[PDB]
Design a protein around this ligand. Structure first.
Ligand SMILES: CCCCC#Cc1ccc(C(=O)NNC(=S)NC)o1
Ligand SMILES: CCCCC#Cc1ccc(C(=O)NNC(=S)NC)o1
Ligand SMILES: C[As](C)(=O)[O-]
Ligand SMILES: C[As](C)(=O)[O-]
Ligand SMILES: [Ca+2]
Ligand SMILES: [Ca+2]
Ligand SMILES: [Ca+2]
Ligand SMILES: [Ca+2]
Lengths: 88, 88
């Protein structure tokens, strides 16, 4: 179904980005930035400044380790979906 | 992108199911049951018993109003994705 498709897309995109460098299970700042810029260009403004990279991670980073893990990525997804859900 | 596709699929599926009866913004038990049975047949066992319908809603229903709203649907999605994410 389309829902099952969306579930595996969420898994797949996190993984193409998280596995690039360092911890293959977490998104560092440069990997988060590339995900947003390449994969969310219709929902979010392109990130061009280091201070925005820094602030975005600061916001997503619930447990405070400096990176975005899968659960944190999932909360980020829920935020965008809710924002899109109620624009309409 | 495939991620933006997944975001709009999440919105769309909740809405086709929630708007069927009563509150057009919330999933009652029969609407939740149909969503899981029709749209999650590869991830979850088909629900055939009222006690399972009752227990599933009890689990998803964080604020205690007897129905599943959008934020609660989003937490349910995060649970299935995490379960699927780490099966592999
Ligand atoms: C082509 C679709 C564009 C039409 C549209 C839209 C729209 C309104 C608000 C958002 C959005 O996702 N923002 N996310 C935020 S503010 N951060 C969590 O997206
Ligand atoms: C065709 C794919 C089947 C292969 C597979 C798989 C798989 C393992 C675990 C789950 C799952 O989503 N369970 N969700 C639960 S337990 N409730 C929150 O799915
Ligand atoms: C070694 As690689 C292509 O996952 O950065
Ligand atoms: C009136 As209807 C087709 O949204 O249940
Ligand atoms: Ca990484
Ligand atoms: Ca973190
Ligand atoms: Ca309803
Ligand atoms: Ca509820």
């Amino acid at each position: 179904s389309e829902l099952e498709k969306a579930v595996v897309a969420l898994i797949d995109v996190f993984h193409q980005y998280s596995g690039r460098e360092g911890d293959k299970h977490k998104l560092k700042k440069s990997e988060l930035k590339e995900l947003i810029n390449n994969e969310l260009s219709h929902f979010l403004e392109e990130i061009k400044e280091q201070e925005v990279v820094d602030k975005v991670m600061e916001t997503l980073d619930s447990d405070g380790d400096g990176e975005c893990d899968f659960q944190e990525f999932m909360a980020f997804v829920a935020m965008i979906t809710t924002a899109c859900h109620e624009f309409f």
